[PDB]
Paper text:
In Gram-positive organisms, the smaller plasmids often replicate via a rolling circle mechanism, a process mediated by a multi-functional replication initiation protein (Rep) encoded on that plasmid. The Rep proteins possess two related catalytic activities, a type-I topoisomerase-like cleavage activity in which they form a nick in the (+) strand at the origin of replication to initiate DNA synthesis, and a religation activity to join the ends of the parental strand that is displaced during replication. Despite low overall sequence identity, there is a high degree of structural conservation between the catalytic domains of the Rep proteins from these Geobacillus stearothermophilus and Staphylococcus aureus plasmids. Structure-based sequence alignment reveals the conserved residues are almost exclusively located in the β-strands containing the Rep_trans motifs, and it is likely the crescent-shaped catalytic domain represents the canonical fold for the Rep_trans protein family.
In this report we describe the structure determination of the core domain of replication initiator protein of cryptic plasmid pSTK1 (25,26) from Geobacillus stearothermophilus (RepSTK1 residues 1–269 (27), hereafter referred to as RepSTK1). This was then used to aid the structure solution of two staphylococcal Rep variants, RepDE and RepDN (containing the 21 kDa fragment of RepD fused to the 14 kDa fragment of RepE or RepN, respectively). Constructs of RepDE and RepDN spanning residues 35–314 were used for crystallisation studies, since the first 34 amino acids are predicted to be disordered and had previously been shown to be dispensable for protein function. RepDE crystallized in space group C2, but all attempts to generate experimental phases were unsuccessful. RepDE and RepDN also contain an additional all-helical domain (helices α6–α9, residues 237–280) previously identified to contain the residues responsible for recognition of the ICRIII sequence at the origin of replication, conferring specificity between the protein and its plasmid substrate. Mapping these residues onto the RepDE structure identifies a potential interaction interface for PcrA helicase, at the open end of the catalytic domain.
Numbering used by the authors:
A (entry chain C), B (entry chain A): 39 to 308
Write the structure that this text describes.
Amino acid sequence: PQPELSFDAMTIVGNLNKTNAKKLSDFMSTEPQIRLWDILQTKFKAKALQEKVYIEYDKVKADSWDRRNMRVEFNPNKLTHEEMLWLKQNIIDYMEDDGFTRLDLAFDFEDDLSDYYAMTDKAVKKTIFYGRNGKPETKYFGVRDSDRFIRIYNKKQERKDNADVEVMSEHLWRVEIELKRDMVDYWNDCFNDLHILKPDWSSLEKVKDQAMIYMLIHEESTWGKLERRTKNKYREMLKSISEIDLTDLMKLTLKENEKQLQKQIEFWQR
Amino acid sequence: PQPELSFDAMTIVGNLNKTNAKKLSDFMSTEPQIRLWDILQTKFKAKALQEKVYIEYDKVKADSWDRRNMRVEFNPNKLTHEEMLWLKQNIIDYMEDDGFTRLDLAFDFEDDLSDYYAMTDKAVKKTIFYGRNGKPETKYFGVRDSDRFIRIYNKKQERKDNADVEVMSEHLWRVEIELKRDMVDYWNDCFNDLHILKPDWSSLEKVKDQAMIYMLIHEESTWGKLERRTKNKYREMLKSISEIDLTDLMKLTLKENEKQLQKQIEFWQR
């Protein structure tokens, strides 16, 4: 099946006037439905819309690193058009120099992705979190502080664990691609380095089968131990087997929704 | 070789008199070499001995929730006996209802553990950090917020990275066992489910067996694919195949030093 694609995180960074800092800082105090803390003249923190939007202004720490001075963080999937409108008009518009610092692509699949893994053509570090059952629930590829980082994890299990409403499907895995800094401008075709795979052996139904192959694939000597009637069974099986690459479906769904997603971005920049 | 064993973290929780709170609060203000903050009559925070001991008193929280009102945190390995003496006499003695809330066992080995297979018989979450190499570097069994949590990792590499004094040995790996809450009283046998092995699948004369193992020891996920009754068969087999199990050396060193360590604890309680 084709995976559903959406943006799942947007950070927007800008710069805010001395005038506007106060103005905005003043505005927000008057609204009890927004929560303010860690206030000074150069600093302000806030969550808005039932805690769905984080907002941080810091002048003293913006300039100390020569950067822009205000972040706004939120998940667009969790905002209602009304809300999106509210946030743009009452916050984003008063920012200048504004662009995207973070942007996350979320591909939901109704298959089981436990055995899938990402590779860039560059050699990267991996982390896998296994459940009590011994199965893998979350996978990290690369590092979170970088232009591109990929999670592959059991959304169903994670939603269940998060006490979210239960879901009709028997399997649900996400592939999140966190694009930061300069990579955000390439979101619309990011897959040149990257492939999301599942091995040869993984595709078999039978644990003993998949072990036996894996061994044959990794220790040449293993053929020498095996009887001829057996050798043929596994020669058959080897040829019968292909590695799977979801990349292609992803690129497809991406292309299919490029224009909507693109508009959905442009919304914030006007 | 036998691994050196030591405690690598202690917290101690207690209650402090109105009289002693002040007495102690008074004492600390006079000493410039201790850093005091967040002070009231019912509150204080402090770091002492060149920032190596954290100390926190809160009465109003303690009254608000029916709890003990003071914690003292430190690593005993990083204290000099002189220092240990100072802390007991000038702080701990003045506590009552005092016991241990955290206790960490650190087994250092001069072998390379990369080449062992580490496993718990118990069903708990595993985290494995893989290197760019594809091989596993660090393993966590359990979660940090729990009665018992285990790290296995390259101490030499971690010490080097930490700009610590270099070490004569070519290899140095730690096995840290963080015991919290009620588990602290069972420090003398907290790792019996844990096994660290060196199996050679080859010596199994049956061939599906050897594949299955080889896979288990090279793809952690494949435990997830085994029904519960099967997992035990292969756990049996693993242990049955390895001449070496470092667990045994740990249990030994532990027994050998149980009495000293025990005294080293009793030191704090008098």
